[PDB]
Symmetry: D3
Subunit: 92 residues, 6 copies
Amino acid sequence: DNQHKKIKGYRDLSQEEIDMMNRVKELGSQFEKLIQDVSDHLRGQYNASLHNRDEITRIANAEPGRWLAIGKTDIQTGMMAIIRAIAQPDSF
Amino acid sequence: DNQHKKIKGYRDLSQEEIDMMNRVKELGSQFEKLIQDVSDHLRGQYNASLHNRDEITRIANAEPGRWLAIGKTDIQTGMMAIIRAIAQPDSF
Amino acid sequence: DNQHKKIKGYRDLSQEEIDMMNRVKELGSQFEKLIQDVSDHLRGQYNASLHNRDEITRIANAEPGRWLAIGKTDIQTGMMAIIRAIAQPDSF
Amino acid sequence: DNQHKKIKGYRDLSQEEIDMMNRVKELGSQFEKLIQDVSDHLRGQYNASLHNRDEITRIANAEPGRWLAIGKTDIQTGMMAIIRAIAQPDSF
Amino acid sequence: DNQHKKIKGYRDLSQEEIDMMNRVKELGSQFEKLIQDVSDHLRGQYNASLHNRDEITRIANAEPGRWLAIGKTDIQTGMMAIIRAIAQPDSF
Amino acid sequence: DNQHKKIKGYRDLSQEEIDMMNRVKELGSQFEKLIQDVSDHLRGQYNASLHNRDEITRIANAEPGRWLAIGKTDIQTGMMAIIRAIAQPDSF
Ligand SMILES: Nc1ncnc2c1ncn2[C@@H]1O[C@@H]2COP(=O)(O)O[C@H]3[C@@H](O)[C@H](n4cnc5c(N)ncnc54)O[C@@H]3COP(=O)(O)O[C@H]2[C@H]1O
Ligand SMILES: Nc1ncnc2c1ncn2[C@@H]1O[C@@H]2COP(=O)(O)O[C@H]3[C@@H](O)[C@H](n4cnc5c(N)ncnc54)O[C@@H]3COP(=O)(O)O[C@H]2[C@H]1O
Ligand SMILES: Nc1ncnc2c1ncn2[C@@H]1O[C@@H]2COP(=O)(O)O[C@H]3[C@@H](O)[C@H](n4cnc5c(N)ncnc54)O[C@@H]3COP(=O)(O)O[C@H]2[C@H]1O
């Protein structure tokens, strides 16, 4: 109960701040859907390329799954930074 | 004309790849709007806090504009990483 | 009141989870003190180097204040990532 | 012997600079201990959740081990940036 | 054909801009070669250390392959940021 | 004298390791030159665009100097990560 008063640096948030944070998180959910769609595209591309040595090698060299994971991480940490800008903890 | 054939590692993109890239960029435009709204909130909060020494000091210590800039950069580079996952350049 | 139930993805935390999060934040406070000490060192070094053109140029070329700001940002975002590992939001 | 004179951009460090660098590295060791404790917590949580399909799925969706690895990397690179602010190499 | 006119924010590039972008990408290829050489060094070091428990443990604790992967990612995203500085998209 | 024996986690480096580190740093110097050339291009572009309101606004919106600074930071930290992969400190 009222666990935020127990966590260092956290403060009481207004309804406006909570609403802005939730807007960030909902836009993030949309990005999650998009990233899942891209991952499905990559799976289908790899499948359609089976036993095409040159195209499989091209895909492997491009490393698209690693780049998608990098992008997902960046989107999530950007979300966290914006939410911190809104919520403004009282601590380092 | 056909400048992509002149840039190292770039390749001919299908309509599906272009569409996915544009989906990423349009979601990014939505994030740009959200970030502008948060920046307006920060400006209004700072203005309403003028000549309240303690609250101005709290805002300054929280560094919300710096955190918003960090978040914007992360969102943009995440977008670029996802677009790279889609477009798959042929070079390092 | 009970604002965490209003924020997307947040959940009820056990006392153990709150304690671990606060441990992260207290270690972060120690890092804040260290970073302040380094900044004081940089200020004193620059002051003691006044009207020594070569040493002022060396300091300017090394960009130590920019590197200290990069380090501070990395420590803070690492803290946030560890706290996310502990608290485990239910959302993207 | 005196290998720093062989590495581009490195310089002779004062005792004060070495002491500050070691302070950064010792605080980092404390963070290493904390991260190990969090990893042990995650292992125990996963073990206690065996054959609870919903809770295992929740943990998997939260990706806590990946977030702990991200946090560890950020702490380490922040340390390196602060140490660079102290030591100030003479090169890009 | 002329696919850049179909992608949001992209613009017509001058020959000078294309040349600068390709300079970035060629320097990046040189970094790719260097990273491959370091990876070969790591493989040879690990091989020469087989059945030397202490040295294998030292290598494992240092995590050199993970640090090489972090460095590769940073070089690639730095390249992308410089290329963005040159090409200057019209969108977020 | 022999300052590396005083810094936590540092070790004695072979000539081969020092050579690889210096190769990384020299490639980095080449990147420094390239980044300076891009910055000169940006200055000249801005100058040639004086009193062209639309083009000045386009440049300002693209934020090319900020993207060049992001790229420089990424290249430098990637260098540091590769050098860490080579040198392999004994500490966190
Ligand atoms: N046809 C293609 N084939 C293969 N891969 C492709 C491709 N088009 C794009 N990519 C990949 O997508 C990456 C990210 O593109 P983004 O548009 O997000 O980020 C781009 C964009 O902001 C900018 N840029 C590139 N071309 C541009 C143009 N014609 N006009 C304006 N900005 C441009 O430069 C940024 C970095 O470009 P970079 O090449 O380093 O990184 C590119 C490249 O790896
Ligand atoms: N009431 C408040 N007052 C002041 N500042 C506030 C605040 N609530 C959040 N913040 C700030 O927002 C940052 C990012 O929150 P986010 O939810 O994106 O990222 C959060 C979230 O993913 C997770 N988290 C925190 N509490 C949680 C909970 N109850 N349930 C689940 N996950 C939680 O931990 C992440 C990192 O938290 P961290 O504290 O390091 O970083 C927080 C903190 O600096
Ligand atoms: N004597 C000196 N003069 C001027 N600047 C100095 C310096 N000693 C260190 N620095 C600066 O500090 C940066 C970070 O050092 P750190 O020990 O955190 O991170 C180091 C450390 O993990 C590793 N490393 C360097 N020398 C090592 C050694 N002898 N043994 C083990 N690891 C070593 O390589 C990492 C990256 O090194 P990098 O040179 O790229 O980046 C170095 C360099 O810019």
